[model samples]
Target: VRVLATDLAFPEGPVVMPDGSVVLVEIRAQQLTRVWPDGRKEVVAKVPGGPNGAALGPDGKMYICNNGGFGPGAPAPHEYIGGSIQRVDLQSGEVETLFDKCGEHPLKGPNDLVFDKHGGLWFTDLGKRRARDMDVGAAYYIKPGMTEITEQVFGTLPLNGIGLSPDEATMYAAETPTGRLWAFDLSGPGEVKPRDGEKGKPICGLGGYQMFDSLAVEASGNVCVATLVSGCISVIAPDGTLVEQVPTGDRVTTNIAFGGPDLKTAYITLSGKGELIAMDWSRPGLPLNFLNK
Candidate 1:
């Protein structure tokens, strides 16, 4: 892998545009930025509450996971304010809040997201951490431009990274502190199977102190997760088997996205080192649902 850009304020959620420019969130800077091929950087919008993961929605706008401001106790490596699902207009630089509080419950920390086949927005609320206690976390589903949200699963671990399998039949969630990848079978949007006696099967877990941040799926259905501590991309097979790990020699690799001519180029966010890097990937990334448009 090679460095594409350095001196970033904790970059994540890389959205590779058709024309080759890459847009991502600078969480520490609280802004959405576009990095062009010529190395020019442009601000798409100044998003608040620590913009985390982002994707191009079906409406031709950018949907972001705003961590709803930073922590009351800590804000290092990345900033925190509050968390919510946010929308931004890439063309006009307009930013708006789409979903913050689902019913009476507020979104503690909306970390990462992936859209489903029906244009339904699936996101994980990683919850918040305080000096004394931590807030509970859960996975929620909703449609863009819709107000209602349905909670699919609740968990103690802070759910950070999230993605869908190529066939859109399974949902993969990476828990931060757990250092494990959990897969939930999708019966439909907002409907998860194996949530009962199955107890959320973990497909992969790393040895040592590793944390998961974000992930991207390969066309072959392997899940490539941005792993922390180890500073590598953990590639897992479709059935929760460990395939390989591509080490980057950095401590905080936060996210990954596939683009380039055949989607084999992986754009990875090395947040701790404040750099964005790319490399030729082993397989093509499964085309993102709406963003592929």
Candidate 2:
């Protein structure tokens, strides 16, 4: 593994750029930062609340899921604004709030997001935790140019990492608290067929005490999940078997994205140690829709 950069404030949501750089969000620092291959870091924009997940839109702008803030390390309740979807122009360093609420219900904690082939954004709201109770988590889908946001999965476990399968037919998400990986079938764009009343089918529930965080899909349809507390990336086959665990020594190994010439470079965020590292993968990652090209 090669350490690309360090001193980040809980970084997540790495967007590998075409120019051979990685742009990620510092959730605690509340900024979008760009890390060059040569180890140079630059602040692309200062974002309010916590910028958790980021993706490159078809229009060449950066789309973000702002989680408002978090526990002790985040901004106090006085300045807390709540979760929302934001759009950022990297060149101008300007931020715009696209959606703060879906109808009357406000988005509690916007966690991770992925853009589909149709430019529709699929994201998870893990909700926020309080001293006495916590909010329920849900998944939402919204097109870039539309005002309507569709809630695809609802009233379920908190989802962290999310991605589409190689064929774009199955949507997989990792449950943070239960160490479960779920697969939901897509009926159409922004549509998921929930089994029974539940939002998804639990294909795999990990053994032991590890929790799930973020994930990336391999070109061969494997789900590479960032396992929290275990300090490794657990690669799971599409049939729900644990294939391998790529040890990353940091408990808060938060997120991963594929880059490099053949998309075999796995850029991972070691959040607990405030570092970003890259390594050669055994298999190449699936080309993300609308971004890889």
Candidate 3:
């Protein structure tokens, strides 16, 4: 892969739209940017809060998780609290608030999101930052039309990234502080619960400066996760096995998405180093049907 863009401020999610352009969130910049196939980049919208993950919804709009103005390793004064999930109209680039309050308290940091077959969204909320305080993260399902917000899942660690299995029966989330990949069973749309006796079981574990970030699913059913600290992409098999690790040359491999003519090209965002790189993959990725056809 080659460097397509530079000077990004902690870019996180890299989503390939149907037209072959790359859409991503610049967390530090608090903006959503789009990169064309030829590498030209433009800011789609200015979202004041820290924007982390982005995905196209069934309604042909973009859904963003704003981590509420707080960034990792940010200065003490920069830690102004709040988090929210927002929607951006694809055609007009109009931003709208989706959900700001979850369970009595405002969301701390809504990080990543993925839509289910029924047009509902599943997202992760990485809790606030404080020197001596550590709060467990949560997962929620938001029905379309923003009518209801359900905290259908919970985790004991700092959950950062999220993705769905090929069959949509399983949901995978990465715990940042613990460097572990967690999987849950999806009972139905807007419904996710710990399976049988597998609650809190780490499906994948890594060491040596590794914390998981955003992730995407491959066409072959592998969950490819962006590894922070390790600066690589870790592929976990459907059965919770480590398959491969692809180095991204930077210490902050924040997110990954399959794009290009056939969706076999993997685009990765090296946020720590502020660069975007694309690579040729051996297998094509499953096109996000919600964004495509």
Please report, in order, the local distance difference test score of every candidate based on alpha carbons: 0.84, 0.88, 0.81
TM values, all candidates: 0.94, 0.96, 0.93
- Write candidate 1's Cα lDDT for 1-293 as tens digits: 67888899889999888788899999888899999977788999999778888988888899999986664234543555456888999889999898778877878888889988778888888787766678766788885445578888786588878888888888888888878998888876657874443336788888789988899999899999999888999999988888999998778898999998899999999898888888899789999988774
> What CA root-mean-square deviation does each model show from the true structure?
2.4, 1.4, 1.9
Residue pairs whose backbone atoms clash in candidate 3:
1-278
Give the candidates in order of lDDT, highest first: 2, 1, 3
TM-score of 3: 0.93
Candidate 1 matches the true fold with a TM-score of: 0.94
Model 3 lDDT per residue over 1-293, tens place? 77888998887788887777889989889889998878898989988888889988877788999888764564254665478989887678789987888757788778898887778788998876666775578888888756778886565676878888878888888888677888887666667654553354578888666888888888788989888777888998887788889988887788888888788899898987898888998777866758744
By TM-score: ranked, best first: 2, 1, 3
The lDDT leader among the candidates is 2
**Better candidate number, 1 or 2, judged by lDDT:** 2
> How far in Å is the alpha carbon of 90 misplaced in model 2?
0.9
After TM-score superposition, the amount by which residue 230's alpha carbon in candidate 1 deviates from its true location, in angstroms, is 0.6
